[PDB]
Design an enzyme around this catalytic site. Sequence first.
Site: not given
Length: 323
Positions: A80, A83, A243, A248
């Site tokens: 992530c 994070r 968000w 991607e």
Amino acid sequence: NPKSLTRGPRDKPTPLEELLPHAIEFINQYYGSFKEAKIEEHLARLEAVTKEIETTGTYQLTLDELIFATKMAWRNAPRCIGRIQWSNLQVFDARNCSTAQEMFQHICRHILYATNNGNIRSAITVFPQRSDGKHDFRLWNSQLIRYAGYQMPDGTIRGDAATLEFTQLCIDLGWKPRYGRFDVLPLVLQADGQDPEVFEIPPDLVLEVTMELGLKWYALPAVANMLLEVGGLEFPACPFNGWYMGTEIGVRDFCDTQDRAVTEINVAVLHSFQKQNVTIMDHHTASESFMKHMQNEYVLSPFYYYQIEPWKTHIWQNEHHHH
Ligand code: HEM
């Protein structure tokens, strides 16, 4: 030594000798954030937690422990990118949820809060923890908002390819399929281990960005199928969101071929989201969200695990035929 990123089903409560060490360790991490303060507080909590586990076979986290856990689990998410600003998370406590109808309302609130008319806010809704493993709360969707994937005669796609199995499952559960490229899938909710119920998501709640060229895409990327593990406890239903990155957005709706060669960029996405004022992880947002994270300042456990797709493990009762 690499560990499994998946945490499967259970059919009986976690045994005490297994749960206690884990609970004790979590309580230590929790009180560890407080340096030399709260030592008597730490010990009083261990006593209470141990007493609970021995008398009820489990224990309940405090709202603050839960909040800390969802954030630590986010911090512990290896892949992530968001994070980095793990403190920027809004937690919705739904541990007293009982029905799929209530799950639906909680999800509606989540979607409504997180979307925030475009100014995306990170949130996670925590449903009841796994008890015996036979009364699991689960969201069968991969994401809260996702487009349907329809199989075609020639073997092609129409919609989102990654949802072929699920889309079919919805149709099998009674859901009436329109055959467009952007059909928002319904919510397939399971409460207390019962057969899942289908709920259409109110159109108003689904914010979409317009990319003929012919494309759209929902503004809210919300993972609905992971399991939160914390101090030995497992939460099979804990949808969360952040968000998009911009790179991607799965436009695997394609024949889109419409330098070297592999040059299909992610440009009109970066701009379209920005001009429609929907938070994307551009440099401004990365910088701003890190700033917000820093102002708050003034095996791996807890952790978000993957699960075995529910339709593959569900012990059907009777409801909705052609399961
Ligand atoms: C603030 C915006 C956020 C951004 C830009 C972001 C970005 C990412 C990216 C790029 C990935 C890897 C690709 C993927 O699996 O989709 C990812 C994975 C993941 N994110 Fe986020 N994320 C955000 C918020 C969150 C939040 C709020 C949580 C949970 C509380 C979270 C938990 C995870 C988890 C568990 C994964 C799965 C992969 C892994 O952990 O290794 N993310 N995120």
